[PDB]
RNA sequence: AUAAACCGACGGUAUUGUUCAGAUCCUGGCUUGCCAACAGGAGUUCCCCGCGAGCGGGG
């Protein structure tokens, strides 16, 4: 990659860059190995969209009816519906698992890192 | 000056040792190469000399 890549991809970054980055390296990445995990449907895991005409539409058509929607997660009683960064993930050899719930799994981002403070009026790298 | 540019897939290694291809076997029997023949035939032979139809001496 050092020797390979174009330079300077890192230097700055936005909302939407930025946030886009976290998701994808919570979910799609298996960054960064030594101690750190990935969840939680694995390391490098697969995802399948049914694609629309317009992103509008496309937003749309992969979002699940509230009874389709019920059906996968009902349980509900043990829920918790918080993400990581409302309620924090139980500490440490927990298990407690399988009562993730509705919310709290999709935004399930585990990488546990404080994002430096803002700069600039710029471009994006 | 192009997912480009700058850019080794690199180094070390017996395929080795033992081994008749052997013993037996007629290619045998029958045939013609015969008939005719003066080695004929024809003096051009190119140049110098000497003595006269020709004769010598020279290349």
Do not use: Y
């Given at each position: 990659c050092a020797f390979v890549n174009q330079p300077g991809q890192g230097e700055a970054l936005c909302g939407g860059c930025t946030a886009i980055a976290l998701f994808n390296q919570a979910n799609q990445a298996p960054g960064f190995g030594g101690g750190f995990k990935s969840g939680l449907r694995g390391g490098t895991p697969v995802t399948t969209f049914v694609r629309g005409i317009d992103l509008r539409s496309t937003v749309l058509l992969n979002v699940l009816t509230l009874p389709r929607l019920q059906?996968?997660?009902?349980?509900?009683?043990?829920?918790?519906?918080?993400?990581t960064w409302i309620?924090?993930?139980?500490?440490?050899?927990?298990?407690?698992?399988?009562?993730?719930?509705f919310v709290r799994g999709l935004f399930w981002?585990?990488?546990?890192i404080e994002l430096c403070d803002p700069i600039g009026i710029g471009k994006c790298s």
């Open positions: 059906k996968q997660f009902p349980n509900e009683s043990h829920t918790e519906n918080q993400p309620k924090p993930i139980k500490s440490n050899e927990s298990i407690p698992a399988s009562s993730i719930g981002q585990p990488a546990h």
